[PDB]
């Protein structure tokens, strides 16, 4: 089985340096890129940057360029995320995730909590020109057994091969649900299905089972920086 295992929780003060790690197992490390993804408390997922372990080529979201360094030691299948000077706003769960441009981010580490002593990026997008994914509605309250329909709209056309859906169950790391707009990832129940193209995408859950109450994120890796929607929380209707 493919696994990514991350290092333990860290507590730091602003200004301190920090390096956290992501160890891959069960697959050829150099054949897949490693992305780093941040989730500040109460916020959605943010793509930070990516490394190709074969040659250590990197790309960074403009928000993180110059703040962090992504590196890799391919001889021990480990990727790293390093700060020279932590900020108070770097308090977050940090995830690493594998991909190769065919199945979006198909395996995720379990997360490293980084706490720094001493708000969220705007869901409607900032001044950077990134592709914005808008998810409707932000919260869906339904009864168990009901059908759930979630929407993801992109600010520009994205090739269907590069639109994915992730499920984040409470307190867990995200996992890949749908890749390439309509393909179910391995092991995912077939009550989940995705459709759409261009700027309009849909995730359907044919019946809400108890384990499906969670948060669902869409994501695109068609253009840089890669981006996530702000998520739709699916919760149980009061009765």
């Amino acid at each position: 089985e493919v696994q990514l295992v991350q290092s333990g929780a860290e507590v730091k003060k602003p200004g301190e340096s920090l390096k956290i790690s992501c160890k891959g197992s069960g697959y050829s490390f150099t054949s897949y890129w490693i992305s780093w993804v941040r989730q500040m408390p109460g916020c959605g997922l943010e793509w930070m940057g990516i490394i190709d372990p074969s040659d250590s080529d990197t790309r960074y979201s403009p928000s993180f360029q110059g703040q962090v360094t992504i590196s890799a030691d391919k001889s021990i299948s480990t990727a790293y995320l390093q700060w020279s000077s932590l900020k108070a706003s770097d308090t977050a769960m940090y995830y690493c995730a594998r991909g190769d441009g065919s199945t979006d981010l198909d395996y995720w580490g379990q997360g490293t909590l980084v706490t720094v002593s001493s708000g969220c990026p705007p869901c409607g997008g900032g001044s950077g020109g990134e592709i914005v994914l808008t998810q409707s509605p932000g919260t869906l309250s339904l009864s168990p057994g009901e059908r759930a329909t979630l929407s993801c709209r992109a600010s520009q056309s994205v090739s269907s091969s590069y639109l994915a859906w992730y499920q984040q169950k409470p307190g867990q790391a995200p996992r890949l649900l749908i890749y390439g707009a309509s393909s179910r990832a391995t092991g995912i129940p077939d009550r989940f299905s995705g459709s759409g193209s261009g700027t309009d995408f849909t995730l359907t859950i044919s019946r809400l089972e108890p384990e499906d109450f969670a948060v669902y994120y869409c994501q695109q890796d068609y253009g840089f920086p890669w981006t996530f929607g702000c998520g739709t929380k699916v919760e149980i209707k009061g009765h």
Side-chain angles (χ1 to χ4, degrees), residues 2-117 119-238:
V2 174
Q3 297 174 234
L4 296 171
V5 174
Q6 299 181 237
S7 48
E10 305 276 2
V11 187
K12 296 295 220 203
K13 288 175 287 206
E16 298 196 283
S17 63
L18 172 63
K19 188 167 181 183
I20 64 177
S21 65
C22 172
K23 168 93 171 182
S25 60
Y27 76 94
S28 170
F29 188 70
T30 59
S31 301
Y32 298 81
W33 296 52
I34 294 286
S35 287
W36 286 94
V37 173
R38 163 169 104 164
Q39 190 167 38
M40 296 181 294
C43 308
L45 302 173
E46 299 173 83
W47 182 83
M48 299 172 73
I50 192 174
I51 188 163
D52 179 352
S54 67
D55 63 357
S56 288
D57 177 80
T58 54
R59 284 181 186 266
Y60 296 94
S61 172
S63 322
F64 297 90
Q65 204 286 326
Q67 299 292 322
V68 300
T69 296
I70 301 171
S71 61
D73 184 348
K74 60 182 186 180
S75 73
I76 60 170
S77 307
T78 302
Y80 303 94
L81 175 63
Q82 193 260 346
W83 292 260
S84 47
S85 186
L86 284 163
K87 302 186 201 63
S89 62
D90 292 323
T91 295
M93 186 70 45
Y94 290 88
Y95 302 101
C96 62
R98 183 188 92 153
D100 69 357
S102 75
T103 319
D104 304 287
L105 301 173
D106 60 353
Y107 288 93
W108 292 61
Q110 87 275 20
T112 298
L113 183 67
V114 174
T115 302
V116 188
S117 56
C120 302
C123 286
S127 78
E130 74 277 13
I131 299 183
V132 176
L133 306 179
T134 298
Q135 287 186 252
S136 291
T139 305
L140 190 51
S141 306
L142 300 170
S143 312
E146 290 180 36
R147 174 173 177 104
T149 303
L150 284 67
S151 160
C152 177
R153 290 179 168 130
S155 62
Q156 76 174 240
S157 185
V158 306
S159 317
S160 62
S161 294
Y162 300 106
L163 194 288
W165 293 87
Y166 300 87
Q167 177 193 58
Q168 185 173 37
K169 303 189 170 177
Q172 301 194 35
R175 66 170 177 160
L176 178 65
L177 208 66
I178 303 285
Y179 65 96
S182 60
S183 291
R184 259 187 309 278
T186 63
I188 293 308
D190 50 27
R191 62 184 179 271
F192 296 99
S193 65
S195 56
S197 68
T199 64
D200 282 62
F201 299 88
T202 297
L203 177 70
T204 301
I205 313 178
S206 65
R207 53 148 64 173
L208 284 168
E209 300 276 20
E211 61 271 28
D212 300 340
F213 293 97
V215 177
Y216 297 86
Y217 294 98
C218 59
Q219 173 260 331
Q220 65 80 27
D221 42 58
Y222 177 67
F224 290 88
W226 298 358
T227 54
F228 292 86
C230 266
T232 293
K233 183 182 175 175
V234 183
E235 63 182 31
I236 296 194
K237 188 181 177 195

